[PDB]
Amino acid sequence: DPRLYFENRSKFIQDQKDKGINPYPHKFERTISIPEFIEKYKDLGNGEHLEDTILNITGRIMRVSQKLRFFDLVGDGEKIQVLANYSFHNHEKGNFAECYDKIRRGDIVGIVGFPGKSKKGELSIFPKETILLSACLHMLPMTEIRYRQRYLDLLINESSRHTFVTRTKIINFLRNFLNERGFFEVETPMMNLIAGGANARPFITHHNDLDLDLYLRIATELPLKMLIVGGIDKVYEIGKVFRNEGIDNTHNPEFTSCEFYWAYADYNDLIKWSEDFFSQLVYHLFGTYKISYNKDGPENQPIEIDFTPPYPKVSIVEEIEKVTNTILEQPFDSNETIEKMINIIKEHKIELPNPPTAAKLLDQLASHFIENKYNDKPFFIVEHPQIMSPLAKYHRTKPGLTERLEMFICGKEVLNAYTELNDPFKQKECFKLQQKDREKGDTEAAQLDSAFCTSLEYGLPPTGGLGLGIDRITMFLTNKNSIKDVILFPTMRPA
Amino acid sequence: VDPRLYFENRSKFIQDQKDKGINPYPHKFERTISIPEFIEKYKDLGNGEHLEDTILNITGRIMRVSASGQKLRFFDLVGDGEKIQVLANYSFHNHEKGNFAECYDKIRRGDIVGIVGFPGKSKKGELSIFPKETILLSACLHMLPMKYGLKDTEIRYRQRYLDLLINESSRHTFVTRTKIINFLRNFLNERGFFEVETPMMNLIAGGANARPFITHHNDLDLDLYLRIATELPLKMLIVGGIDKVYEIGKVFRNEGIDNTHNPEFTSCEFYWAYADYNDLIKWSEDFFSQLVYHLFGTYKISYNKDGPENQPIEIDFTPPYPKVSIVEEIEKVTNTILEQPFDSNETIEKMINIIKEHKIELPNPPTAAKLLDQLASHFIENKYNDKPFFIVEHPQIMSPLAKYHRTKPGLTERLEMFICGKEVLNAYTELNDPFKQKECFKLQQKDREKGDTEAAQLDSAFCTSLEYGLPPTGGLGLGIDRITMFLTNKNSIKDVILFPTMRPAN
Ligand SMILES: O=C(NCC1CCCCC1)c1cc(=O)c2ccccc2o1
Ligand SMILES: O=C(NCC1CCCCC1)c1cc(=O)c2ccccc2o1
Ligand SMILES: N[C@@H](CCCC[NH3+])C(=O)O
Ligand SMILES: N[C@@H](CCCC[NH3+])C(=O)O
Ligand SMILES: [Co+2]
Ligand SMILES: [Co+2]
């Protein structure tokens, strides 16, 4: 019974206290970490002892096994054995049995001792003195607990640490990749008067002193472009954005994105950037371009994803048309075209979007016909209609379309990029269209950001911009089917 | 000369260019060299020297327009904070692309252009691009304000891009900000620390004494608080065995704006298992000294504490830095004895009287913690100006998350570093006894009931995590913005935040 175990440990602490002992000492000066210990002494011979090498080492006890006490000691994801021998015990410090009888699995300890190997060749610390540094009062397990008590996940599941180490490696790699190419990292506000730069529902909060409602950012696009106007010609931000919508395996309402803006680049530069970056990232982590991924569960058959460039480009209107044996004529929001798309939707028994605006219909069609086209490789969906893409520049040869690219891995979007719309005339127009779409009941529609439009009037150079979803990328590169598995503290309802 | 009319004429110009079949916003210009690279490559040409067979593509923003008769047009071209001259000579113009004068007459200050041309120096020895063809890439439709015409205005903060374009020091300030953060991240990574991200939205806002922002997730039907600190989940990661962990990112404090307060700001917090107070002081002295030396090549900086028009003072970041015990110091400068418990009637009355006589604001409610805090802020925090210093050994009632001092009853092992009277750093040996932790939370709660809306609220998830064993640990926080203010010579936090928090424009 856990409750009783805990009661007993609490009374152990209190009893230690009454008897004038400090069960939470302030400082233990260790001389070596456990990984460093393993590195330095793993070449010892069986039974060999370095008894004149006195070391101070700390760690968490994870195993407890009568003049010979055995323990497993863990630190920084690595483990050594603790071999307490009566014959080595410093008797001046207290009773051997009393000392080691008190130790429980989970306890954090400080050890003064020497390095050796057991006769069986197990690398070990041989204590002359062991000190309790911090007691574990519950029973450590030997579920939702992983997400609510991530510290348990990290202590017991060795794979957890590796997953988050990989996450941090991915972000380090991205930062270095951008910095080596002359990009300048900035911070832009997380609280805005207006939430823009994407089509999503915002979080709203309130500043008391200004008596002002503020929106948490849904993207970093607009202030970054404003910085390009300011002459920071290669600029980027890695940080949190917030989207007030439901939780599922590929959606957390706060997630980490990276956006960069690259003056004098366009669509083609961005496609090349994407292929270079993903192929190089994957090679950096694996030394190969092919990884395996369990798209449908940890014990079902994995598929192989090949990150060898180049990647397929699939124009969205043309592909929808081709797989529906239909023709979707412009204006895409004409009665005939809207009717046609609605009919395609109802015919294939897929959810009719509410409201059924042209953009929402197109997006639904793409979702159901295109986005799962390839699973064995990343691919781009390209040349999105202008009505789906209010911030992307019109396509230089294809009326009605834009110079946009979205990259997908196993049917999930991880990347969105385009040649940037930089004519303020056209931008105000796009904002008007977006708003009349909000008037139809579309609550994810873009609102007019006058500060941003004003900045366009001062001259935005031709520019290419790109956004990455760090969490989804991490999912694919650590073999997780749920985004909860790559965020340390995913958003959950109180227990 | 009217800006409105200027803008109307410019917009009409765009429309007419389109009508005449010209695209005034080209999709792609493929340049072959940047302006800094052009300067590096060709700055050593002799006067009057032309490299007329070296044809280059270059882009930039026009920042000056001048002419000389019919066949000479002069411009200043800027990019990446550096500047070259454009010398458009009729002699070199590619007449196949259009009329020379018509082409260059259209160009205005602020226009972004693409130039096909050759490098050279004028006979006066100005480094120049000599266009054969100049292409408009993006028009500036407003009149750009000129240098020093952008002072004493909010324009800098609402239209940061104008600040960046026009005031050269601006770029430098924000570059230095990014260099400081790079330096910090590298400093920690080289010492074995592991960078993580913890949630910005939480069921409870803990880890500091501050009023939070509140928001709402619709789908879970759930109120959430923006984080006021990163302390609690990072300590939970220490429990989890990530023994050197840190985060650099935004935190949110729902309070008023002034020269050292923006409602969102950037902090770094790190947690260091098996370290304590003394390690934290050393880390601080090492970090600040090495940072300053890395940016300046010296340990001493000048700082216009009182604005650009009054004399600067000099700050010496040469370690070590003075340590000042808070209670002993308040006692010493007020001729008082502040006996424990600090919340005792006698002691509270003593502090209320000290505050009354020195004519300083009385906190509401007058809890012992807030009184001591007010006394400290009035009497200690400006003890030194020519060097950073630490205030140390804060009472436990001021310090709900800090471990009791190992030899001094009622105190904690805490340190705060101040530069010119401003806190930039808060650190301590971490409280890792869950029993004591719940005690401190209950005390805080009783302060909350008595009107202190900044009191620490109980975080059961955190306390429960302490029950699994938090090793002895040292923790530390830095205010990136304030640090940057001191290292870029700014008196206002708005000057080091690209887009500081503001009310809506007209
Ligand atoms: O990774 C995500 N998206 C991929 C995007 C990210 C922004 C930059 C373009 C690529 C992503 C991740 C999410 O967790 C998420 C949650 C709610 C709504 C949308 C969400 O999107
Ligand atoms: O830099 C600031 N404080 C220094 C602290 C920051 C957290 C880590 C310890 C050091 C700071 C900066 C602010 O802008 C600010 C705004 C509102 C309330 C408090 C604010 O504090
Ligand atoms: N803001 C975009 C990413 C950048 C698109 C290119 N300007 C998004 O959230 O999808
Ligand atoms: N959370 C602290 C910084 C770290 C203190 C050491 N645990 C603050 O906001 O001041
Ligand atoms: Co989509
Ligand atoms: Co204070």
Author numbering:
A (entry chain A): 79 to 143, 147 to 223, 230 to 582
B (entry chain B): 78 to 583
Would you copy out the relevant sentences from the publication that reported this structure?
By using the luciferase ATP consumption (Kinase-Glo) assay platform with sub-Km substrate concentrations (thus biasing the assay toward identifying ATP-competitive inhibitors), the GlaxoSmithKline malaria actives set of ∼13,000 compounds (the Tres Cantos Antimalarial Set) was screened against recombinant PfKRS1, leading to the discovery of a PfKRS1 inhibitor, compound 2. Compound 2 displayed similar levels of inhibition of PfKRS1 and growth of P. falciparum to cladosporin 1. Compound 2 suffered from high metabolic instability (CLi > 50 mL⋅min−1⋅g−1 in mouse liver microsomes); however, in contrast to cladosporin 1, it was chemically tractable. Screening hit 2 was cocrystallized with PfKRS1 and also binds in the ATP binding pocket, in a similar fashion to cladosporin, although the bicyclic core is rotated 30° with respect to cladosporin. The ring carbonyl forms an H-bond to the backbone NH of N339, mimicking the N1 of adenine and the O1 OH of cladosporin. The cyclohexyl moiety projects into a pocket formed by the side chains of R330, F342, and S344 and the backbone of L555 and G556.
Aminoacyl-tRNA synthetases catalyze aminoacylation of tRNAs with their cognate amino acids in two stages. First, the amino acid is activated by ATP to yield the AMP-activated amino acid, with loss of pyrophosphate, followed by transfer of the amino acid onto the tRNA. Malaria parasite genomes encode two different lysyl-tRNA synthetases (KRSs) that play a role in translation in either the cytoplasm (PfKRS1) or in the apicoplast (PfKRS2), while Cryptosporidium parasites and humans encode one copy. We present a selective inhibitor of both Plasmodium and Cryptosporidium lysyl-tRNA synthetase capable of clearing parasites from mouse models of malaria and cryptosporidiosis infection.
